[PDB]
Every structure is written in structure tokens, then in C-alpha cells.
Design a protein around this ligand. Structure first.
Ligand SMILES: COc1cc([C@@H]2c3cc4c(cc3[C@@H](O[C@@H]3O[C@@H]5CO[C@@H](C)O[C@H]5[C@H](O)[C@H]3O)[C@H]3COC(=O)[C@H]23)OCO4)cc(OC)c1O
Ligand SMILES: COc1cc([C@@H]2c3cc4c(cc3[C@@H](O[C@@H]3O[C@@H]5CO[C@@H](C)O[C@H]5[C@H](O)[C@H]3O)[C@H]3COC(=O)[C@H]23)OCO4)cc(OC)c1O
Ligand SMILES: [Mg+2]
Ligand SMILES: [Mg+2]
Lengths: 778, 778
DNA sequence: GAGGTATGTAGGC
DNA sequence: GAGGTATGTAGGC
DNA sequence: GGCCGCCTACATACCTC
DNA sequence: GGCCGCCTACATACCTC
């Protein structure tokens, strides 16, 4: 068994006194090695005797979905392990280490005494990924096979502090375990004075003195799992079985533990399995749902919106090419991505990919390097080390305006601003892209719609001159859906058809009877075009009718020749019995693809939402964009009023500076006093010149007060009359813009509808420019 | 054979038309895959037929040092391959692919026809590492075993452009191959207008259109190696044999190719092996010498000083902990490290390590995490992802002053400033650290001296009040070396002894005759203390006298018990015959270590230098520090005079601003004209407030001219009388400092000697503070 | 007297 | 009517 | 996310005649 | 510096009675 340092005096007569430390990873392995190799000067703490160490190798395989429970009709319920379940390395290694067998029920004391270890202790990072997923899977495995071990306290975990607050002059921390508990303590505290807060997002984050202090009290922080009667149904719901049983379980939200329950947990270290599944596992499931399911407003997940915000910040100053690993490091540093860089780099590569049938029809990045062709389905991309990306600055700036970004709700990580909670683009991305992802109860599949039907719908909704504007609003009222929405034909030489309530994409083929070669030039929408030939070479009877398959397709195009038997050409027609929707050759070559859509997204609040059609998603996305435009115009009006009054005061001071002559006043106090005496308005120029994320009410409440720094901070060069004339012209331009904004707020359909129209035209032009340049705008 | 995609139609009757593409890495593999899978629309270019692909897996093993050439006395010179040479994976894979046997000499045409490929083509990055090292090793292998293959043009390479300059409106580049050629072309060019310069520091840097254009002319850029009569001695010198034979070969410098030779190379693609060894291999050897051998001024290699400069820039704003991989990415991005991050992260970890016997006695970083203990010799450090570092801000700022860093010579990469060419600290790091590195002809071994003898020497050199000042200067004159230099005793409980001309470090042991257990508590200076017990468990007779060895040592301390045979205690004394320098037990347990020093460093110019003693290194380091102090004081004097005159002009304008009243002047032109009329001095305040990297002559030549921006850029708040009084006091302080500087330049030993003394005291205090806090200054 | 074997360091492929 | 087998996507371990 | 072949020198061990 | 086991759902194939 690899990554297993055997504990001495284990497996013998003293085996009942030995514990096995199951680590979720190698960082936990290193922490355990340090703690157990403390050795001398720490006799109370454990050493490698009576303490074995084993790694779980990340998450483990869910055995609830592997067991079959067949042939229980013989009077006994026998459970048969899957061959994939039998051949797993980590589970069989754990079974070998413990010396346990599946056939035996560990009822009496002797059966447990047969074990090679007294108990198994799990050490995982104090986070959702590991405390609720890895530990949850391990607990489910043990409950599924040997419930008596959990009942008799064979399974336990070592609990580590997530957050430590140190008060100055005191060496003991508060070691809080959950974010909610720490927040409650902080709000209970009068102030955070002389308090240093440290977050341990992983076991390896602990320091040498910290791990020494932990292992000094290693007899503590060890909690035994207990099995209740209600735990069976919870284990069945969360792991294994039908997905729907957990769907209705994951649409509610995590119920926090009562104070009495937490007090019982900490007083005596006996964690019920039901409570663990209710809290930690459910929290992990909800987080994974919010992490792997896109938000319908921006059509992109937390990872991809985080990447987009990081790219916007990184490439704003200069659009120079950046290596994928460097950009991922920048995103993790600035956007507070605390998971890793393998998945982040993979997500960046996927976001920057662009080929026929790729997931992203309008990528947010332009990629320099080899990002993979349609033939490998994006799997042939090069390493992130030697691959560069750039921000599609014009497409993003026309699709995600910065002024909109200023007014979006934002996610705050540890009190610091991070990527926005959601973006509200001028056009719905959730309808314009492809995707097929499972996530802990819900599957997400989306097929992109044409960028002619969506444009028509949005323009008819916004433009009052559109003849279908009133009809479209009535459709919004009563869900008529008068205008059509159709799958995108871009980069697809086949043809889409609709039968019943389903769409099918067909590849095209050429038959040369005299040459007896079948030429296929376009395959279904998202087939990898290389796994396709493997599928057609593995169909037993399909391969019998043919002799050779050669792939002459270059990049971006498909051209495959099939040499078949001379007498089979008619026989195939007799073999497959073509229907009205697919031909005999299409049936033979699997050229038809039924496209299914699972329109499951996450709400802006954080829940799950399911749409029956793409019209519903569009109708849900419309009001958010309307309200964003309206509030953006209102904020622009307010800030422009403030800027006009500030600039008028500035010009007045520039005019009167000769008369005032503040060169003979003591300091800023006297100068501010005399400026207030002369009637100059007090206002904080920092907020006026840059409101940033300032709402209307706070903008007003902060601009009503302030200092006279605007007057004091202006340089001598601004006193020249040319600068004053430029300032006056700027005031005229700003007041004209203010009048235009006031006109915009009174527009007939809704405020800012015309601005939405020009934005739509600009983003359409940018998208066309991208399409006709292979998404290489240079 | 792994990483080998067999070419079709190879190994048969058409094998003579097939070529094998030997790639130094997987990025080259990806480039070759793209080029060969271009396929359609590129019929002239090659495809996977007639073109095999194989990876070299980085550098290969040098077979010149593995062959033995034994038993040639039988009338024939038979060469015997080493078992390590036989068992190498990559070389045997290449041999299998080609179908080459070692016994046969490929004289006639039939023997070459027996080969499975027509020729072997090497593709490597156009840089010193790969074109001169990997290709050089491959050429040496082929020349050593089958010279007739090189003679008959079996070995060839594909050459790629290092630098491409594109002129606007023209699609063809200039594709320059060497830095010298590109520099000559650029200086020949009148100006760099409408020219875009792209550097390809690796094959994967090429773009899709670029690789398509390259493979369109793939019949070109293929150069066959030719063997000359003079190539045998060159191959022997550069690879294999004695090191000294190349020592005198690497102390000269690379001789550039003549224009006629380069014209012959590019006319007919026939590269002589002698020219390749003379240019590319020698350049690689010189670069590796400069890369792996520290500079005696700062005692750190190019990578290490690059890391130091990157850390100084990164942690200057905030000393917050940074992950090792993040810091390595920052260093690579800002200091232009174009090799990787594996070696960079390893170097960062080694630089931040601190334990008894570690290489760095005074690390430049304080490490948060597990950097490894003395037991594994630093090999037990954790992964760079979960390990943090901080800059030892006070130690660095007292040891590498910033004002010194302003005046150092700097390395410019592609016209952009990078880490300094060398640091010259207040105390010689080359004398105060450990190290043992081979580098292409020279070995570097250094044992740190005590930080009491070095301090005494430097203080006696600098302080004129020291009673040995004149004696030390006379010693400098005639190399007496009156004062002693001894190895450091810190973190070493043993004792150093000197015999003849060599120093020996001894571990200490305690003998308990009644207990019959030998307890060793301190081992030699740099033994890993775990490989030590492996060495003592592998000595056949040394293990016979003993029964058990147990390691009770914790971190930072050594405590090992040896249980030996009851009657062996006296027999060991009879077995080993103790000498006057080592005892019988010390001989038995290998507790004596002779410390050897190979004082080989790199000159600031770029050569190699060898010192016979540490006194020579100290005497070489002293004048550089003296001159830096003198020039720093000169620059301070000049810039302080400039700041005095600028501030006096500023105060005069602030006083007269009421009378001037520039508020009625049209623009900056008239304002500057009237200021010049009033007698205000013109000078560029940007250089005055921050000369940054500016010499005396350029500082003067730029300060004599300038604009009046200093007057125009000052804010209104500065016109208050308190600001004017503060400015006047600042002028008084700066003039007093100027007088003190003028006094400093007239100091008796040399200018700035006293400043050197205070610097020495400050760095000694900071070092002591680190020493007594386990290098954890917090 | 016998050497050729294996190790080991930092900066790189 | 027979189900259990294998695959496959993106974000994570 | 760990792990593994190589170069370069030079000294020091062991091993075998 | 590449490469490899897992979770999550769901539809669609094949395979076998
Ligand atoms: C060895 O050390 C540990 C490894 C792991 C697993 C892991 C486990 C594996 C395994 C591979 C991996 C690997 O995943 C790979 O990442 C790749 C990243 O690029 C993308 C393109 O492709 C991904 C592979 O699809 C995936 O397989 C690790 C990445 O980060 C992890 O957490 C993964 O192959 C065999 O078992 C967990 C640990 O404890 C927490 C460890 O200590
Ligand atoms: C697989 O892909 C390639 C690999 C390579 C080699 C390499 C080769 C190896 C091998 C390992 C390695 C590995 O070195 C390892 O790095 C580690 C980095 O952390 C430090 C602590 O420890 C280092 C190991 O001491 C070293 O062994 C690569 C790192 O960068 C390289 O260049 C190395 O084990 C077997 O053969 C070259 C290529 O073409 C250019 C490749 O395509
Ligand atoms: Mg985690
Ligand atoms: Mg290179």
C-alpha cells in the first residue's frame, strides 16, 4: 500500500491501542509527519507508534452507487461490490491496512479485536471540500458496509481550527471552527483592537509552533462519530440512489446547529452522523451547486466570472499577452481564489478556446498558442506554461460596460472586495453558449441560440419603433412567445430540424456509388469528430458493412472517407430501415444528434432555478438589465450634478484667487475658514471625481459634507487663463450631458432604452468583427 | 519506446526516405505534431509519413564519461559501455528506433541502408540550453560511437529563428538567429520605425501561422552536421575526460563565427561539428559557469541575486507573507527569468532555509512553513504551493542599502532594466556562507568564516583608531595576513582543528562503559545526520562491532544512541589504531570531516577567478565597497546641491507669488517666459526629486537644463505660511547635511569610512537579533 | 599498488 | 419488457 | 499535486586484484 | 514538466436475457 507508513506495534496484541490517520492529501500527510516526529520533548503527544498514517488521495469513490444488492431473494440480503468498486486502489489499500473483511459483521467485541487498528481518524481541511465531501464519502462507505463500526465508535475525526484570533499579550487563541461562529463572535465583540485574525484554509497553513501546540493536546480535538436511527435515510439521500431524492433536499438551505447541540458536541466529542450530513455535507452540496451551475444573468459560473473580473483588472492597463499560469496566479492573488491553480488554469484554457463546436461561442479571451482543435474536443491544448492569453478588450467593453460594473452587487471575501456577485451583460450569455455539466443534483445543458432571433427579441422589447414592441410586451405579460428562438447555425454546415418537442442536428454526407466511398463533411453539433470514428469503429455490425475509415479532415473542417463493401451499399438501406426524420446512411453513420437542454441555473440570491424554455430565461434576464440601466442613469445624473457644482466653485476660486491671496494665511484651518466665509461650498473632491461603488443615498450623504481640498489641491498651472477657459468649456459640456441624461430618464418604454439600443448595435458590430476574424481581432 | 509516434513507411524498403525528429522536450513535440498534422492544404510540407518523432526528455546522459575503452591490448580497440550507459531509457529507445548496433561500423552504403530511418533531425530551442548542451551531447554521443554517420551526413538539425522583426506592410520577417546578429542589424538600421520585434525563447513560443509558414518551407532550415579532422580533440575537450583540459579552454571566451563561415553555412546547409562546438557549446559552458558559480562580491549566483532583487521590489511596499510559487511567478515576470519556475521555486526554498548546517548562514528570507530540517539536509521541505516567505527587511536594509543599489551596474534584458549585475554589501557574503556546486569545469566549495574575525578585519581596515589599521594596510600591500580567519562555530557543538593546511570538524560523543552505549550528540559540520546513519549501517565491518542504532534527535539537535557488542568496546580501539588527529571512536563512527574549499568565483566583468585563501577574497572585495561608498557620497553631494537650489527657488516663488500673480497669463509658455525674466532657474524637478539610476555627469548635464514645472506643479496648499516655514527648515536641514557630507568626503582613511563603520555596527546588530531569534525576527 | 563502481550538492533541460 | 455495463462534460479534491 | 532520468568536479568512500 | 484515480446526472449507446 502506497503512502502508508505502518505504525509500529500495530496489528498485534496491542493493535487495539493504535489509530490510523486517514489524510485527504499530502499536505495533511506532512502535518501528521511533523506532529508524530515531534517525538522527544513532547512525551504526552503521540508518535509513529500507535498512530498509522494513510492518504485518501483527494476525494474517494462513492461506493453507494457501486454496490448492487442483487439476489437478496435467497433469504439473506447479499450486497455485491462493483468490479470498479473492487479494483479501486485507495479503498482496497485501506481495507488491507485495517485487516477488515466485507463478509463479517462486527457485532461482538472479538470481531472488532480482529482489526489491525483500534480506530480510524480522518484529518481533512476545515472547509466544505473535505469536511462534508471527502469525510462524507468515507462515512458513507463505512456506514454502507460496516454500520457496527460507526455504532461502536470505530470512526472518528480530528478537528482543526478554521480561524484563530490572537489578542495581544495572550498566547491562547479563540480557535473558531465555522465562519458563522466567528462572525457572531466578532459582532459580539465591542471592537477588533489588538486582535490578529488568521485563516487556515488548509492543514498546511498551520505553522510549526501552531502544530506543536495542536499535537500537545492531540488527545483533544478528536471527535468520534455516532450512528443514529435517522442517519440511514440521510445517507441514502445524500449519497447513492436517485438524484431527485436529493433535488428536493437541496432546494431548502443549510439549517445551522442549535447552541445546545454544539455544546453537546464540544463537551463530549461524539458527533452524530445525521448532524454532520445535515450541516457539512449539505453546505458542500450547496456550494458545489453554486460553483458548477452558471448564473442565468451572465451565463457563467463563479469560477468564470472570477476569471473575467481578474482579466478585466489585469489587462485594463495593457493588453500584453500573459502566460496562462501567470494569469491564473494573478487571478488567485487578486480575486481570492483559494482552491488551487490546476482547475483555474484549466478553466482559463477552456474560456479562451475557440473552435467549431466549442463551449464558448463568444470567448472572453483571445488565445495565443495551441488551445486545441475540434478533433480532440479541446483536449489537445498545450500546457498552460507555454500558452498566452489576451483580453478581448473591445468585445468585453461593448458587452460588459464598466459603468455597469460600478453598480453591480459584489462578493466580499474576508472583508475585501472581490469579483462581482453577477454580471448583467447587454445580451444574455446563458442563451448564447454551450455547456453540459453535472452538479450535485442538477444537470446543466444549454444549446446556443442564433444571434439573429435573440437580437430581434431584445430590439423589439427595447425599441418602441419596432412593429412587434406592443405584441412582445403582451407576450411578456401572458407568455405567448410570438417570435422564434432557434439553435445557432454558426460553424455548422449541417441542418437543424424540429420534431415533436426536440431539435436534431444532422451531419451531411456524400455518396459516390461508382466510387463506392461515403464522404462525410459535417458531423453533429458537438461530437469530437475523433471519438466519433472510435464509436463507429466499435459498433459491431456497423463495422461489418465497411472496410476502412480515413480522416482527411484538417483543422476547423471535417472530411472523412469511408470505404465499404462493394455489395453492402444497398444492404445498409435494408439493414437500418430509415425513418422520416433520419436517412438510412444517417442511421448507419450516427449522423443525427438529438439536442437536450437542462435549463438549470442559480439565482442571484444563491438558490437554484429551473426554466422550461429559453424564452423564460430571456424574460427573466430582461428586467435586471432594465433596472441596471435605470439606476446607472440615475447615478450618472447625481454625480454629474455634483461635478458641475464642484467645477463652478473651482472656476470661481480660480477667478478670485488674486483677490483672496491665501499666501498670507497660517495653515489649512485658516484657509478653510476664510473659504467658508466667502461662501465656497464644502465637499469631498475624492468622491466627486471618483464615486466608485457609491450608491445614490451614500453619494448624497457624503457629498453634502467634506473639506475644501479641491481648492487647496489644485496646482499653480491651473491658474492660467487657458486652463480656466478649458474648465468653463468642460462645465458647458457636462451641463449639456446632464440635460441629455434628464431627457434619457423620460424615455417612453423605460429610462435608457435608447442607450441600450446603441449598446446592442456596438456589441453586435464587435461580435461580427470577431466572427469574421476567427476571433483574432488583430 | 515511450513518446515515440512511429512514422509509417519507415523501417522498410522506403526507410531511407524517412527522417526521425528528435525533440528536446514535449513543447517541441507539440510543435512537430502541429506541423506534421497540417496535412491537407500543405502538400509540399511533410506529414507523419517519412517523419518520425521522438523526445529526448530534456538533456541526455554524457556517454563520453561512461565508456571505458578497456582491454584494447588484444590488437583491437574495444569500447565497453557502462551499465548505467546500457540501462538509460532514452538512449536505448533511440537505438531501438533507429535500429543501430554498436558493433557495426557504418562504412559502406549497405550498412547505412540497414538503418530504420534515413537520418536523424534534432529540434531544440534556439538558446544556449539545448543548442550547445542537448544537441552538443547528442552530437558527442554519435561521434563517440558512429563517426561514419556524422561523416556521411546522417545527423542533422532543424534551425529555428530566435528573433523575428516584422516591418509594417511586409509579411516576411528577417528571422535572425543570434543576439549578436540582431544587434548588428539594429545598429545598422537607421531607426526602429514600423518594426515589431518578437523573441522566441523556446519552440512553443511560435504561433499557428508562424509554424505553418515554417513547415511550408520545411525542406529549408535543415542543416546537416559534417565531421572534420579537428573535431575529435574538440569533442574530447568539451565532453568527457579530464576537467582541466577544458578549464584552460573556458578561460578565454567565445570566438564569433566569421562572415564567410556564416555565409557558407547558410548557402549550403552543412554545419561543421567543430564550429558548433566552438560557438554554441562554448557559449553554453560559459553561461553555465556564470549561472552556477557565485560572484565573490555578493557571494550569490545570477538566479539567487535575481531572486533577491525581486524580493526587494516585491516586499518593499508591504512585507506580507507570499506563497513560494506566487513569489517565483513575480520574480519571473519582473526580473525576466526565462527558464522556468521549478528551479526558481527550488532556489527560493533553498535561500529561505535556515537550520544548523544549512548553506545560507544569513538567509535573505524568513520562511513561514516547513522548509526542512537538518536531518534530511533540506530535502524534507514542503511543496512551494503551501509555503510562504517574507523578506528579512531590516537585515537586507542594513546589509544591502538602497542608496547603494541606486549606483550599482545593472543587467539589461531586451533593453529593460533587471536585477543588478552584482551586489556589493557591507560584509562579504562569499566568505560568510556555505556551498558545494559543480559547474562545467570548476567546483565551488566554501566554508563560512566566523563573524568575529571578519568583523575585526573589516573594522581594522576601515577604522583608523584601530591599533592594527596601519599593520592591516601593510598586510594588504604585501599579503602578510596578520589577523586570523577561522571557520564559524555557530550551530556546531563540535570543535575545529587545523593540521598541515587543512581544517577538520569533529563531532562529539559520550561513552558509557557500564551502559555499553555510545551516545553521539554532534556530528560533522554539514553531514545530513540521516544519510550518516545509512553510511554507518552500510560499512561492513563497522556494523559488525555494533548491534543497534537509534535516532532520538529532535529538530535542531542531534542525539543518536549506538548499542554495540559487550566485548567489542576495547576491540574497536584495537581495530582502528587511532591517530593524533582523530580518536579510535571518531575513526569508527566517521566523526571527523576534512573541509575542503574550492574558492572559484566569477568576476564582475564576466570571467572566472580563483583564490588561494579567504584573505584574497576579502582583499578583493574591500576596494569595491570603498569605491561604492565614495561615489555614493559624491552623488549625494551633487543631488543635495541641486535640491538646495531648487528649494530656494521654490521658497522665493512662494514669497513673491502675490506680486507675480500668474493668474492673468495665457498659458505655460508666457508663465515660463516671465519666470525666466524674473530670474527663476530652469531645471527638471523630476530628476532632482528622484535621480534614481543617474551618474554624476548625466545628472549635471540634465540639471543644467529643464523647465519651470516645479513652480507650476506646486499646489495652492503650499502657499500657506506654515508650508513655507517648513520648506525653509527643510532647506536648513539639507544644507547642514550637505556640510556634513563635505566633511565626510575629507575623512582620513577614505571618504565615507565612518559611514561604513556605522553600517557595520547596524548590520552586526541586525544579524545578532536574527541569531538569537532563530531567524524569526517577529 | 589495483580503479570503477555509487553519492552529492545548485541551477538547468 | 430485461438493467448494467461504459462515456462524458466543468469545477474541485 | 508528487515524482522521477540526466550535466557539471572532486573528494571520499567501497570493492576487487 | 506530463499524467493519472475519483464526484456529480442523464441520455445514449451496447450487451444479454
Ligand atoms: C499526487 O498528489 C495529490 C493528487 C491529488 C489529485 C489527483 C489524484 C490522482 C491523480 C491525479 C490527481 C491530480 O488531478 C489531476 O489534475 C489535473 C490538472 O490539470 C487538468 C487539465 O487535468 C487534471 C486531471 O484530470 C486530474 O487527474 C491532482 C490535482 O489536484 C488534486 O487534488 C488531484 O491520478 C491518480 O490519482 C490529490 C491529492 O491530495 C489532495 C494529492 O496529494
Ligand atoms: C515530463 O516532461 C519533461 C520533463 C523534463 C525534465 C524531467 C525529466 C525526467 C524526470 C523529471 C524531470 C523534471 O525534473 C524534475 O524537476 C523537479 C522540480 O522540482 C525540484 C524540487 O525537483 C526537480 C527534480 O529533481 C527533477 O527531476 C522536469 C522539470 O523540468 C524539466 O525540464 C525536467 O524524471 C524522468 O525524466 C524535461 C522535458 O523536456 C524539456 C519534459 O518534457
Ligand atoms: Mg480544501
Ligand atoms: Mg531553453
Amino acid at each position: 500500500v502506497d503512502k502508508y507508513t505502518r505504525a509500529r506495534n500495530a496489528g498485534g496484541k496491542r493493535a487495539q491501542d493504535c489509530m490510523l490517520l486517514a489524510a485527504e492529501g499530502d499536505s495533511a500527510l506532512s502535518l501528521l509527519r511533523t506532529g508524530l516526529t515531534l517525538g522527544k520533548s513532547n512525551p504526552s503527544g503521540p508518535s509513529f507508534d500507535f498512530c498509522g498514517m494513510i492518504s485518501l488521495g483527494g476525494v474517494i469513490m462513492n461506493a453507494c452507487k457501486k454496490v448492487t444488492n442483487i439476489t437478496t431473494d435467497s433469504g439473506e440480503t447479499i450486497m455485491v461490490r462493483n468490479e470498479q468498486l473492487t479494483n479501486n486502489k485507495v479503498l482496497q489499500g485501506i481495507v488491507q491496512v485495517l485487516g477488515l473483511d466485507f463478509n463479517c459483521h462486527y457485532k461482538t467485541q472479538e470481531e472488532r479485536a480482529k482489526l489491525r487498528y483500534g480506530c480510524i481518524v480522518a484529518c481533512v481541511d476545515q472547509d466544505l471540500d473535505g469536511c462534508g465531501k471527502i469525510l462524507g464519502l468515507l462515512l458513507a462507505y463505512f456506514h454502507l458496509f460496516w454500520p457496527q463500526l460507526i455504532i461502536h465508535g470505530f470512526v472518528k475525526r480530528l478537528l482543526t481550527p478554521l480561524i484563530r484570533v490572537y489578542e495581544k499579550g495572550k498566547t491562547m487563541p479563540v480557535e473558531f471552527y465555522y465562519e458563522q461562529e466567528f462572525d457572531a463572535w466578532a459582532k459580539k465583540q465591542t471592537s477588533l483592537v489588538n486582535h490578529t485574525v488568521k485563516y487556515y484554509k488548509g492543514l498546511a497553513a498551520h505553522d510549526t509552533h501552531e502544530v506543536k501546540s495542536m499535537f500537545k493536546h492531540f488527545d483533544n480535538m478528536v471527535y468520534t462519530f455516532t450512528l443514529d436511527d435517522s442517519a440511514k435515510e440521510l445517507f441514502h439521500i445524500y449519497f447513492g440512489g436517485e438524484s431527485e431524492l436529493r433535488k428536493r433536499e437541496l432546494c431548502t438551505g443549510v439549517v445551522p446547529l442549535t447552541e445546545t447541540q454544539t455544546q453537546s458536541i464540544h463537551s463530549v466529542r461524539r458527533i452524530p452522523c445525521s448532524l454532520h450530513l445535515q450541516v457539512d455535507t449539505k453546505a458542500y452540496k450547496l456550494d458545489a451547486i453554486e460553483r458548477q451551475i452558471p448564473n442565468f444573468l451572465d451565463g457563467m459560473t463563479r469560477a468564470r466570472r472570477k476569471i473575467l473580473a481578474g482579466g478585466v483588472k489585469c489587462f485594463a492597463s495593457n493588453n500584453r499577452e500573459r502566460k496562462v499560469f501567470q494569469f491564473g496566479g494573478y487571478v488567485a492573488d487578486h480575486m481570492f481564489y483559494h482552491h488551487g491553480d490546476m482547475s483555474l488554469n484549466t478553466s482559463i484554457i477552456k474560456a479562451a478556446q475557440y473552435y467549431p463546436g466549442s463551449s464558448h461561442l463568444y470567448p472572453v479571451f483571445i488565445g495565443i498558442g495551441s488551445f486545441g482543435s475540434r478533433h480532440l474536443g479541446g483536449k489537445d491544448a498545450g500546457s498552460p506554461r507555454y500558452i498566452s492569453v489576451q483580453l478581448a478588450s473591445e468585445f468585453i467593453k461593448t458587452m460588459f460596460p464598466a459603468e455597469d460594473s460600478w453598480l453591480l452587487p459584489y462578493v466580499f471575501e474576508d472583508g475585501q472586495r472581490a469579483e462581482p456577485e453577477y454580471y448583467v451583460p447587454v445580451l444574455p450569455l446563458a442563451i448564447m453558449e454551450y455547456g453540459a455539466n453535472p452538479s450535485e443534483g442538477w444537470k446543466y445543458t444549454t444549446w446556443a441560440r442564433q444571434l439573429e432571433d435573440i437580437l430581434a427579441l431584445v430590439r423589439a422589447y427595447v425599441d418602441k419603433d419596432n412593429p412587434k414592441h406592443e405584441l412582445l410586451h403582451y407576450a411578456i405579460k401572458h407568455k405567448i412567445t410570438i417570435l422564434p428562438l432557434r439553435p445557432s447555425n454558426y460553424n455548422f454546415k449541417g441542418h437543424l430540424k424540429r420534431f415533436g418537442q426536440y431539435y436534431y442536428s444532422y451531419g451531411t454526407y456524400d455518396i459516390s456509388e461508382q466510387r463506392n466511398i461515403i464522404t462525410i463533411t459535417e458531423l453533429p453539433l458537438r461530437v469530437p469528430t475523433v471519438a466519433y470514428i472510435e464509436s463507429i469503429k466499435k459498433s459491431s455490425n456497423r463495422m461489418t458493412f465497411i472496410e476502412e475509415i480515413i480522416d482527411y479532415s484538417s483543422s476547423e473542417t471535417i472530411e472523412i472517407l469511408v470505404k465499404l463493401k462493394p455489395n453492402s451499399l444497398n444492404r445498409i438501406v435494408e439493414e437500418f430501415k430509415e425513418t422520416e426524420e433520419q436517412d438510412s446512411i444517417e442511421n448507419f453513420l450516427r449522423l443525427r444528434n438529438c439536442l437536450h437542454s437542462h435549463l438549470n441555473f442559480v439565482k442571484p440570491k444563491g438558490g437554484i432555478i429551473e426554466f422550461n424554455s429559453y424564452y423564460e430565461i430571456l424574460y427573466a434576464w430582461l428586467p435586471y438589465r432594465r433596472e441596471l440601466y435605470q439606476k446607472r442613469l440615475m447615478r450618472e445624473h447625481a454625480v454629474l450634478k455634483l461635478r458641475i457644482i464642484m467645477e463652478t466653485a473651482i472656476v470661481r476660486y480660480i477667478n478670485e484667487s488674486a483677490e483672496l491671496n491665501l499666501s498670507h494665511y497660517e495653515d489649512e484651518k485658516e484657509a478653510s475658514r476664510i473659504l467658508s466665509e466667502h461662501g465656497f461650498p464644502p465637499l469631498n473632491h475624492t468622491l466627486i471625481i471618483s464615486p466608485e461603488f457609491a450608491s445614490i443615498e451614500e453619494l448624497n450623504q457624503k457629498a453634502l459634507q467634506g473639506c475644501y481640498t479641491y481648492i487647496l489641491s489644485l496646482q499653480a498651472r491651473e491658474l492660467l487663463i487657458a486652463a480656466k477657459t478649458r474648465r468653463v468649456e468642460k462645465i458647458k459640456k457636462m451641463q449639456a450631458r446632464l440635460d441629455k441624461v434628464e431627457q434619457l430618464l423620460q424615455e417612453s418604454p423605460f429610462p435608457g432604452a435608447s442607450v441600450w439600443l446603441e449598446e446592442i448595435d456596438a456589441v453586435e458590430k464587435a461580435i461580427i468583427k470577431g466572427r469574421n476574424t476567427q476571433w483574432k481581432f488583430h
